[PDB]
Design a protein around this nucleic acid. Sequence first.
DNA 1: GGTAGATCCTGAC
DNA 2: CAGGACTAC
Length: 252
Amino acid sequence: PQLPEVETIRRTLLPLIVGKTIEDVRIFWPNIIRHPRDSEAFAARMIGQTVRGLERRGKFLKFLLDRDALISHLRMEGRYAVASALEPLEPHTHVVFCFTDGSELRYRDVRKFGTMHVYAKEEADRRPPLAELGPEPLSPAFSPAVLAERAVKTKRSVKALLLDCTVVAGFGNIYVDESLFRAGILPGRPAASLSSKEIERLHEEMVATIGEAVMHLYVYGRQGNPCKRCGTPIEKTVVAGRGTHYCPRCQR
DNA sequence: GGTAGATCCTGAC
DNA sequence: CAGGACTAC
Ligand SMILES: [Zn+2]
């Protein structure tokens, strides 16, 4: 799920778990647990704590408990569900939080790429994976000025820049490609080659694209098909190790 | 210190 | 072989 989807998850999941107390934590793929490194310590510390809140930073979910915070990233295909402990688990369920009311918060992930970190709440923001996270794309903290500053000081492509979580929080591949198309900028352009006008336009489109989503595609996954603006076949290449889609006429 | 590379997994082609 | 986010040149 991307940022907009994660925000939806945060909004919808909260009322389903708030006020519930953890009685057990069951882990079927320990590698998901990143801190404490020992999955048994992870499980033990959470028992007895009540869920008090749920926040989002970038694509990370932050579960607020009594003492600790649980920081969770779903990556490509991670999913949470709340269901009865009496029913069989769905396939690919790797972590389950059991509540005293007989309900469960279940984490599924066919790819097993998701991660979980638990720290005392006051530490969470100064530890991985939240430390160094850039500003929210929809916040004043993410401005053309901030974007321009990062762009001038790097030799990387503009796409590589936008994918950098330290530059802006949780801007996914799909939104990078879409934003770059809407701003009329080639993904392979050196970040430092962008004019002040192009930086301004890009920031504008980044906010509009992600902002619309939290509330059709031009290029992403449309390779070989006609551009919706000019009819030129959309092309796909690799930039910054990622599938990269663009229109060679609309983008320069 | 900045930046590329290795890292994980597995359904899919 | 793509996908998001610690090690070593
Ligand atoms: Zn076009």
